[PDB]
Amino acid sequence: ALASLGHKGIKTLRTFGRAGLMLFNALVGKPEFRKHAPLLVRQLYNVGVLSMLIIVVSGVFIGMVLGLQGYLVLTTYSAETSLGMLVALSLLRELGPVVAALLFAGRAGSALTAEIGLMRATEQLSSMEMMAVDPLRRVISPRFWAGVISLPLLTVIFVAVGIWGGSLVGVSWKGIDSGFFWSAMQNAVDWRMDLVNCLIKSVVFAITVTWISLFNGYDAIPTSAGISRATTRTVVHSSLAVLGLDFVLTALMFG
């Protein structure tokens, strides 16, 4: 057991070292953002805009499911007018950021890894190094900043759409009074601190997810089979990291 366990331990430590080195070498730089706008805009399109339909269509459904499962519980205690509070808080605290991060790792967290692994397979990174163009500054950092900028926005869209789906189920379908719903929801729970905590954990999830994605796409074996073993590894490790960091951040920000 110990014959291979220590080798695996030193291998995992070396993997963490390579990841940290990639991040540090790709982030340090003063001329970073300017002259890179035509890169960052394209990356915001690839990472952000293309990953918007899934976010919206999933937010609608999660809002509807929350509305149903909250109505069927609150109608027992005559508190069905607090369904707005329930939906909004369950989205702004746990479901919103975590589910947005999972779907981002699925759609845009695996696309980045696949794209960078394929760019490494056709030897575009080596060809970019051969003409004195540092790839870590030319191909990594635009994607990293696109992911970091684009996940906390998809999270806001996911929330503001799930709230509307819960409104569809509660107010329209079930028949709750809209005034009670909205007024009950806004004064009681939507404080500045809940939105700030949502955005904070969303930004942390963005950082970790896009870092894992870029690293697994940059450290993959160039063969067409090592890429697919890196996309699945990206999805798995990113889901695990999202859930663990979510538990930690909940324990921090909610007592």
Partner 1 sequence: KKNEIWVGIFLLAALLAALFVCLKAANVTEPTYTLYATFDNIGGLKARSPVSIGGVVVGRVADITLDPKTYLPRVTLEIEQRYNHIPDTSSLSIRTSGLLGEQYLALNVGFEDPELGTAILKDGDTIQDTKSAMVLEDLIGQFLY
Which of 121, 157, 203, 207 contacts partner 1 by CB under 8 A?
157
Which of 41, 73, 133, 236 contacts ligand PEF by CB under 6 A?
73
Which of 27, 32, 40, 69 contacts ligand PEF by CB under 6 A?
69
Which of 39, 40, 56, 79 contacts ligand PEF by CB under 6 A?
79
Residues 6+ apart with CB under 8 A from 21: none
Where in 18-47 is the site for partner 1 (CB under 8 A)? 18-21, 24, 38, 41-42, 44-45
Residues 6+ apart with CB under 8 A from 214: 22, 26, 112, 113, 116, 140, 143, 144, 147
User: Does residue 69 bind partner 1 (CB under 8 A)?
Assistant: no
Name the binder of 70 from its own copies, ligand PEF, partner 1, none, CB < 5-8 A by kind.
ligand PEF
User: Does residue 90 bind ligand PEF (CB under 6 A)?
Assistant: yes
User: Does residue 72 bind partner 1 (CB under 8 A)?
Assistant: no
Do residues 220 and 113 lie in contact, with contact meaning Cβ atoms separated by under 8 Å?
Answer: yes
Name the binder of 30 from ligand PEF, partner 1, its own copies, none, CB < 5-8 A by kind.
none
User: Does residue 248 bind ligand PEF (CB under 6 A)?
Assistant: no
Where in 32-51 is the site for ligand PEF (CB under 6 A)? none
CB of 24 to its own copies, least distance (A): 27
* Per-residue three-class SS string for the chain: CHHHHHHHHHHHHHHHHHHHHHHHHHHCCCCCCCCCHHHHHHHHHHHHHHHCHHHHHHHHHHHHHHHHHHHHHHCCCCCHHHHHHHHHHHHHHHHHHHHHHHHHHHHHHHHHHHHHHHHHHCCHHHHHHHCCCCHHHHHHHHHHHHHHHHHHHHHHHHHHHHHHHHHHHHHHHHCCCHHHHHHHHHHHCCCHHHHHHHHHHHHHHHHHHHHHHHHHHHCCCCCHHHHHHHHHHHHHHHHHHHHHHHHHHHHHHCC
CB of 182 to ligand PEF, least distance (A): 14
Name the residues that contact partner 1, by CB under 8 A: 1-10, 13-21, 24, 38, 41-42, 44-45, 48-49, 52, 75-79, 81-82, 88, 153-154, 156-157, 159-161, 163-164, 168, 172-173, 175, 177-180, 182-188, 190-193, 195, 248, 251-252
Q: Which residues of this protein are in contact with ligand PEF, per CB under 6 A?
A: 62, 65-66, 69-70, 73-74, 76-77, 79, 82, 85-86, 89-90, 93-95, 98-99, 189
